[PDB]
């Protein structure tokens, strides 16, 4: 099996679907990754987590180094043997999360001292970190311009991180196993200045990178903004590897970003609006909380192939969400993540057919409705 | 498939092993019952509950009554389609939660009064509600008398539990689709006083029953007091019929319980225990928080068959339940359900091959070492 081989097997306009084939198996794109920050993708064993058609689940260099530890991690075998999940996984490098998550930080051209609430992170601690983890696709170790930054400021924030991209590159391939066996992605910063992701583009292109993530994003800049960055940033990388764009999102924040030339996806809103409540349906969202739902013999979604509507329905799901009943946020869960993947396929097999236009239209037309 | 069928197939001392032929399944005994109290075992998917060997689960009267509503799960198809569990369930009747759980109660001849935190459960309720959610075992109702009790207030009490228990199988064969479908067990009262238990046994058979339940221990008597009463207590129920020890209870409990003939069981302690940190082992139970096993790659328990020990270990499940991690509390009661029904499976094939004996003997030796 190769390290990295990504083929884009049909394309229409700007949108891409193919496949990348890895060590610990292929990834259909465009893809959806479930987010498993603690070692976990919340609610749902593994066997769970593919049985809804998930291909590669994201982790997290951040959680995972204050807990468990790396170092743990990799003693206990790494992260696939440790959470029982043996095909590949992504993990972000804590470039944002530190930023977010910890209560105090500093930060300097060498890396980012913070508290968890005392630790370092740095380009070659966080590929370090990852190979500890045995990671299949590493990130770079970037800084995540806030949103609203000035283009001074987004500047010499993206110019650290194309520093930190080079630095990361060079750990990356002087760990031969790490080298053979799995692969980095560089991230484009810059935030809603197009110069200054042209010059983070070029930057990471001269590197060269197995793929490359459209960073700085889904920061609270808002769907238009975002769209309109991506139709002037996406086409900067290059076309024939994969571009993931970080973070996103909802399903037509996924729709619209294919449309734009991202092959690749990671949000918590399954998982998390599933726990809180929310389910996904082919006619938008749903509470299932409200009492409009208390005798709905319905499943979840009328269409949807998953385990959770084929067996239980809304009105049950209701109850146990109410009630506060963990099997609530199972079902929720695996429902909403199913939903995510079947979106994906939809996307996938449009793409290929030639009429993801139509596709998306109808999607929208429905989902909006 | 017939309504009630109760086979004995094998005897060593007052053990009793045999079969419940209902007809939504069979019930191999002793058996454990998982309980479901909220319509749901907690964290666990109807088939996960399957898979660890359960034949029969538990509901409860008492919480459906309120949350969902009895009505409201009749009119969406029973109790059985609702949680989609489609073997036998027996429900407790409301007795001993409505006092245990209630802010305000009001006691009489006709039933209880209560406040949830305002409902009646009587004798004709409380066997229309377990009609109602489809119940295949329907408990009678009782009051489970407070411990310690005078011998007269013991009395009062379980005359008053044999006059409900008459008005429960009045009520029980007035509902002819019930009484053509479900089964109906007595529950014995009497506290710790040998003569009330008697009366109450002698009560119990006049009116007759398809099985005898044990009530009223399991309320902060300890073993050695709970062995004593079952000791005189058991034996004067029908000997051709299923006996229920309810709330019961730890591991060696129901290996006491079943020399003393006790053929059923259920307990909230797997579950609760299992969310809570605690697996139990041939090796007695185990606290998964506890540090030492934060680098442990043995499964939680060395021979334990459950799908939990053949993927993870303790070091993974230690770090769940330390984040609170769902999955957590999946695979800890997963674990323990299993645990208890290999227990179960251990007690009936000893009794089947005349070597429970041993068994008792061997399984304290190694629990409590
Ligand atoms: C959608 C929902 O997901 C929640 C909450 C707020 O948005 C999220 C999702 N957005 C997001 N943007 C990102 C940008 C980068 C980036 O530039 N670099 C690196 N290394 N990792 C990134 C990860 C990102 N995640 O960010 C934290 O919580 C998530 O809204
Ligand atoms: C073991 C653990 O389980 C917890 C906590 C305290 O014990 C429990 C278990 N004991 C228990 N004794 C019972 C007696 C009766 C009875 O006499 N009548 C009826 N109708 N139902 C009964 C159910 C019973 N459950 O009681 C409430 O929480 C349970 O300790
Ligand atoms: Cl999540
Ligand atoms: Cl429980
Ligand atoms: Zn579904
Ligand atoms: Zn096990």
Redesign the interface.
């Known amino acids: 099996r190769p390290r990295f081989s990504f083929s884009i097997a049909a394309r229409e306009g700007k949108a891409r679907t193919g496949t990348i084939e890895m060590k610990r198996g292929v990834i259909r794109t465009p893809a959806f990754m479930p987010v498993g920050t ?3 993708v ?4 593994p066997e769970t987590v593919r049985a809804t058609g998930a291909d590669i689940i994201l982790g997290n260099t951040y959680h995972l180094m204050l ?2 530890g790396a170092e ?1 991690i990799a ?3 790494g992260l696939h043997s ?3 999940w043996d095909r590949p996984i992504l993990t972000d490098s804590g470039g944002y999360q530190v930023m977010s998550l910890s209560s105090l930080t500093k930060q300097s051209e060498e890396g980012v001292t913070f508290k968890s609430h005392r630790h370092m992170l740095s380009p070659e601690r966080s590929i370090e970190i990852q190979h500890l983890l045995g990671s299949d696709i590493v990130m770079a170790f970037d800084e995540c311009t806030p949103y609203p930054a000035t283009p001074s400021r987004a500047a010499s924030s993206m110019e650290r991180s194309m520093r930190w991209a080079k630095r990361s590159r060079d750990a990356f391939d002087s760990r031969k196993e790490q080298a053979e066996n799995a692969a980095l992605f560089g991230i484009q910063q810059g935030s809603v200045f197009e110069n200054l992701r042209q010059q983070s583009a070029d930057a990471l292109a001269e590197i060269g990178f197995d793929g490359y993530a459209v960073g700085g994003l889904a920061v609270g800049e808002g769907q238009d903004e975002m769209f309109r960055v991506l139709d002037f940033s996406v086409p900067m990388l290059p076309d024939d590897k994969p571009h993931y764009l970080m973070g996103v999102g909802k399903p037509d924040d996924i729709v619209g970003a294919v449309e734009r030339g991202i092959d690749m996806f990671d949000c918590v809103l399954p998982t998390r609006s599933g726990r809180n409540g929310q389910a996904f349906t082919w006619d938008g969202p749903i509470n299932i909380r409200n009492a409009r739902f ?2 709905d ?1 319905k499943p979840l979604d009328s269409e949807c192939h998953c385990a959770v509507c084929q ?3 809304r ?2 799901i209701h ?2 969400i ?2 506060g ?3 609530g ?2 079902l929720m869960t695996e429902h909403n993540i199913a939903f995510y993947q079947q979106l994906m396929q939809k996307i996938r097999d449009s793409i290929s057919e030639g009429r993801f236009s139509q596709f998306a239209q109808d999607f929208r037309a429905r989902y909006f409705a």
């Open positions: 603690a070692a976990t919340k609610a749902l064993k807990r468990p743990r003693k206990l075998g440790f959470m029982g208390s005798e013999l067996k239980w329905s009105a049950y109850h146990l109410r009630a009943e963990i099997l946020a199972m």
